[PDB]
Amino acid sequence: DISGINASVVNIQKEIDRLNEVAKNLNESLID
Amino acid sequence: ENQKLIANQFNSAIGKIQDSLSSTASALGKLQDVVNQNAQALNTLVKQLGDISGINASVVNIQKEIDRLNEVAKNLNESLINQKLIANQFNSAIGKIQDSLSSTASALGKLQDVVNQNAQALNTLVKQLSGDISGINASVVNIQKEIDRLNEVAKNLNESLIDENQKLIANQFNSAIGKIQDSLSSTASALGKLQDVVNQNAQALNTLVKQL
């Protein structure tokens, strides 16, 4: 009666990658 | 005109920041869902299985914080862009971004707390049931450094507000961008650590099920 219980895994790597990508690209928005 | 350049660089920055807020809200929603799914899984295990009957994993609710991030991402459109106008639009954007940073820190703290509460619940279940399951151990997550950093940036952005003046605007803007970059890097770190611990503890629970 417990054999099917299964915890799920989470995948947010796409979102994490985008945050670092924005953090890097904001350098191009800087004003001279 | 340097005002065109400032306006365009500012508008560029806001759009990237909107992107990051939308992505943060998505990651927070996905973490909320999986945490709650795995809490339900643990509680189902306890129910199917006297000394364990009260063990209960908690659920997390950060929908208010997620909603606010998306709202700021949308409302930042009104901050898009004359020195008065630039200063006022900039100051407007900073306050919304401060709001989003405060909400992100809140959501991260609640996720940290529920993840750790449910890790303790699983470890208590293992201890009560203990040969072949005795080493199963859920890990705890520590992202307080990142949470502290978000709140500090939210606070320190007050010094980037705007009260020759193109230099002042440019320098205040550049100051804000660097702080926001700091907050984005810290958010990404906190999200990765939560992702990793959630997945570790999901594997731990699944290992417990398999052994039992």
Residue numbers in the entry:
A (entry chain B): 1168 to 1199
B (entry chain A): 918 to 966, 1167 to 1198, 2919 to 2967, 3167 to 3199, 4918 to 4966
Task: Provide the authors' original text about this structure.
S2 subunit includes heptad repeats 1 and 2 (HR1 and HR2), which mediates viral cellular membrane fusion by forming a 6-helix bundle (6HB). The formation of the 6HB fusion core is a key step in mediating viral entry. Here, we screened a series of 5-helix bundle (5HB) proteins and found an optimal 5HB construct (5HB-H2) with broad-spectrum membrane-fusion inhibition activity. Unlike HR2-based peptides that cannot bind spike in the pre-fusion conformation, 5HB features with the capability of binding to pre-fusion spike.
The other three constructs are truncated ones, including 5HB-H2 with amino acids of HR1 E918-L966 and HR2 D1168-L1203, 5HB-H3 with amino acids of HR1 A924-L966 and HR2 D1168-I1198 and 5HB-H4 with amino acids of HR1 E918-Q954 and HR2 V1176-L1203. In order to learn the basis of the 5HB/S binding, we further solved the crystal structure of the 5HB-H2/HR2P complex at 1.9 Å resolution. In the crystallographic asymmetric unit, one 5HB-H2 bound to a single HR2P peptide in a 1:1 binding mode. 5HB-H2 consisted of 5 α-helices and interacted with HR2P to form a coiled-coil complex. Overall, 5HB-H2 created an extended hydrophobic groove via two of its three central HR1 helices, accommodating HR2P. This groove featured with a series of apolar amino acids from the two adjacent HR1s arranging in an interval way to form a hydrophobic interface. For HR2P, its helical fold would align I1198, L1197, L1193, A1190, L1186, I1183, I1179, V1177, V1176, A1174, I1172 and I1169 almost on one side of the helix, matching the unoccupied groove in 5HB-H2 for strong hydrophobic interactions. In addition to the hydrophobic contacts, we also observed a series of hydrogen-bond interactions that would contribute to the intimate binding between 5HB-H2 and HR2P. Via the structural study, we have shown that 5HB-H2 assembles into the proper five-helical structure and binds viral S via the canonical HR1/HR2 interactions. It is worth noting that the HR2 region recognized by 5HB-H2 in our structure is highly conserved, such that the amino acid sequences are 100% identical among SARS-CoV-2, SARS-CoV and other sarbecoviruses.
